[PDB]
Design a protein around this ligand. Structure first.
Ligand SMILES: O=C(NCCO[C@H]1O[C@H](CO)[C@@H](O)[C@H](O)[C@@H]1O)c1ccc(-n2cc[n+](-c3ccc(C(=O)NCCO[C@H]4O[C@H](CO)[C@@H](O)[C@H](O)[C@@H]4O)cc3)c2)cc1
Ligand SMILES: O=C(NCCO[C@H]1O[C@H](CO)[C@@H](O)[C@H](O)[C@@H]1O)c1ccc(-n2cc[n+](-c3ccc(C(=O)NCCO[C@H]4O[C@H](CO)[C@@H](O)[C@H](O)[C@@H]4O)cc3)c2)cc1
Ligand SMILES: [Ca+2]
Ligand SMILES: [Ca+2]
Ligand SMILES: [Ca+2]
Ligand SMILES: [Ca+2]
Ligand SMILES: [Mn+2]
Ligand SMILES: [Mn+2]
Ligand SMILES: [Mn+2]
Ligand SMILES: [Mn+2]
Lengths: 237, 237, 237, 237
């Protein structure tokens, strides 16, 4: 299977597979059963912001999700990603719907990665920023139901023309370029990601959520990963 | 054929195809016959620096090449790259040898591109920096004789183990990711590139040179583009 | 006498001192009498964006002023700013009202300066970005009527409690830190400034405008520089 | 009394005031008595690199000091710098000599500060980079014996014409511009500093070291702060 490190914005409580009873954010290391979760007052129809950060000095993967004029939710897990991920990865956005549904709209995505060497004492670096997405976005790999160009936004899951989200949808977008995420010969490896999202449900209960994820370069949507598996895992182990 | 916009560091005077009699730098728009050239005191065995810049306001493509403690050489050509390049390109380094030869060593390469929109008044951006190159550089597309990992440097053309450059060599390295270089809906499109290079000849006459180039995403070394064609052109037209 | 290089967004034609017959943008080298202007369809009460760029390679100062879903005004002048400016400068925003008036509201301002050279592989840089201003903004020097903190915005000129601008007002905001704007020992000196503004006038005649400027470090508002002199010049020579 | 947060590269063990028995690095919160230290194999006359990082999400100040081809020393402390620092600060480098001495040479210094929030999609930032210092560096406040321009290097403490460091010397360099280091209204506050240094001692006993520090804006060298107090503290409480 793929190797997956993910930060999940999980809108739907699957309490039979370790989810708490409320919308939550979570750090996923090779399982959909988050190693750490925190409560999250997702705001239906509002534009939200996720900030993810990692450095190799702290070995702490942290996420903060906020909306204008609200308390934030933050979650942190101590993990040494040199021991979990390959050296070269891809970075991506993933979302799903199941029996219940939501728009999984991305309005912007940025990402930075840096290696500062010990062997040569010099740095390697990648930064992208999308504030608009276009109909033909040749630096994104779109998988499953994911589309671009509707209002200059990335739609991770299937929406009708009037704007109605479909169930049993799964979708991802990956940056075209492999990223050098770690190097044993380095002093400080670090990355950050930021995206803004709009999750809108006609339902009183939306599902299933959005994740930022780091994977093997060849990662693809595992089979049957709609609903609670968020396009990231083949199963709930 | 490929579409090619190139800045050439041309070490060898092919006066039968429009070259001046001395080492020169040049701006190449779809031909090896530079639209503008300037004299260049290439320093055999010294680490040099090339800076290339473009913005959509000036529509001026400029290059500056310098060595520690020397006069610079600069060249500028007014060109509207929205009228020459496709919207999506790749960026790359190219070099060649022919009857005469030189190391075409790259020690570092950086690149930045930005679109600042008029439709949405928001910006898209890509930045990479290599200060080291590794043996398995998965964000570079290596073509022809190009290799990485020898001293953490990119060797564009074939060098023996003792360090002797071979003739009739051609080589390129392209950033894995397509770049959105222009957009009619934008207010300012701009890019810059920087690389450091070491060109060393045992000869009194080195050849053939190094180029930074922008091409169609699928660009490949045209056939017979060793020597004076620098890996960029199928012919000298 | 201060030394002033400025880009003027000039909302009011003073035809007696060289202004064209319409709202225009202009490059001002040591004089209110623009070396170069371009027609500008200023949009009353709409948020506009200004982009200024200079590089020492083309020795070309350019500006692009734009509004969402409109044509751009752009203006350009060939000038070598080391023949005009001292090595060390402050950067700022100025505005003024006269018999006629307008809000001179700045919602955001960013600035970048680099000196790259050939000592080895290292360069010198400064960058600030204000996307909101606060009531005590200690990295800004406010002069004349300029104030900050009202809706996180810089108000260059006097505005009453109930929203309406005052006549015979003049204000400026300077970045606290001096900027190394040129060095003789550098191969490429460059800078870039961006600001978003809201110019609102109660009636069809608004005055006098906004400028981005570069001055000597101890630059201050010259006497009698309200209205047409934009807070920048003592006289209209 | 100044408010001081500091990372100390401490070359001389003052065991009477809590120093460990060996050269160490240390996180100093309002006291010379480091809250946290780590062994550090200082290399006489070799160029080292210091990396400092803080983010408001982990509330974790970390430092990594390294030399080419050697193990790193790293040190980390959980501290909320809005409970310690005022909102507005200066950043600086300090060094000192006592009965014993060393060059306190800084070859380069860079610094980055960001406040991201949720007003909409905009954030506030500062960034400077010095890769060479000049004889009149107007964006630095030099204090005590600190000087610039000798081989493009910052000399924090007194060095004679013929290369040898002086005892009972103390000097500092502050960035001219105050820094907004925390805001209550922000979701992520972060900063990062990097400097390269050359510590050369004529004999086997060198003293006293270098610190990167953050202080109140009008911070100055306290009385009698040579040697073990590193230019930072009035006393060893
Ligand atoms: O709106 C203005 N100015 C614009 C507003 O400007 C402010 O606001 C602007 C916008 O905020 C800002 O840009 C500016 O910096 C400023 O603050 C303005 C208007 C009038 C002013 N002003 C002051 C005195 N006068 C006078 C006085 C006398 C005569 C006369 O006797 N005229 C008779 C006819 O003259 C003819 O017959 C005579 C006899 O045969 C001859 O002598 C003459 O040669 C001519 O043939 C005219 C004007 C005019 C001053 C400014
Ligand atoms: O190198 C130093 N310091 C290090 C250098 O430091 C500088 O340089 C460093 C490196 O640049 C820097 O870190 C520092 O901040 C500083 O600038 C240093 C060394 C000596 C100093 N100093 C000044 C006066 N004294 C005296 C005076 C008298 C006695 C005595 O009579 N000793 C007799 C034996 O004592 C015993 O018997 C007695 C009688 O029964 C009892 O009373 C006692 O209790 C004990 O049992 C000793 C010391 C010492 C001060 C500093
Ligand atoms: Ca769930
Ligand atoms: Ca040639
Ligand atoms: Ca005017
Ligand atoms: Ca000590
Ligand atoms: Mn979950
Ligand atoms: Mn040529
Ligand atoms: Mn004018
Ligand atoms: Mn200590």
């Amino acid at each position: 299977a793929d190797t997956i490190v993910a930060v999940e914005l999980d809108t739907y409580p699957n309490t039979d597979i370790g989810d708490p009873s409320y919308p939550h954010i979570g750090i996923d290391i090779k399982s959909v059963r988050s190693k750490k979760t925190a409560k999250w007052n997702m705001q239906n129809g509002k534009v939200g912001t996720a900030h993810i950060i990692y450095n190799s000095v702290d070995k702490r993967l942290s996420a903060v999700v906020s909306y204008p004029n609200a308390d934030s939710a933050t979650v942190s897990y101590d993990v040494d990603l040199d021991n979990v991920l390959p050296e070269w990865v891809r970075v991506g956005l993933s979302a799903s719907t199941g029996l219940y549904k939501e728009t999984n709209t991305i309005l912007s995505w940025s990402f930075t990665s840096k290696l500062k060497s010990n062997s040569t004492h010099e740095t390697n670096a990648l930064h992208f920023m999308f504030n608009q997405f276009s109909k033909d976005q040749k630096d994104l790999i779109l998988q499953g139901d994911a589309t671009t160009g509707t209002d200059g936004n990335l739609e991770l899951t299937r929406v009708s023309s009037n704007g109605s989200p479909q169930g049993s949808s799964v979708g991802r977008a990956l940056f075209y370029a492999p990223v050098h995420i770690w190097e044993s010969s380095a002093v400080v490896a670090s990355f950050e990601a930021t995206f803004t999202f709009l999750i809108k449900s006609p339902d009183s209960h939306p599902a299933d959520g959005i994740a930022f994820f780091i994977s093997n370069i060849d990662s693809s949507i595992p089979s049957g990963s709609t609903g609670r598996l968020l396009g990231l895992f083949p199963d709930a182990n």
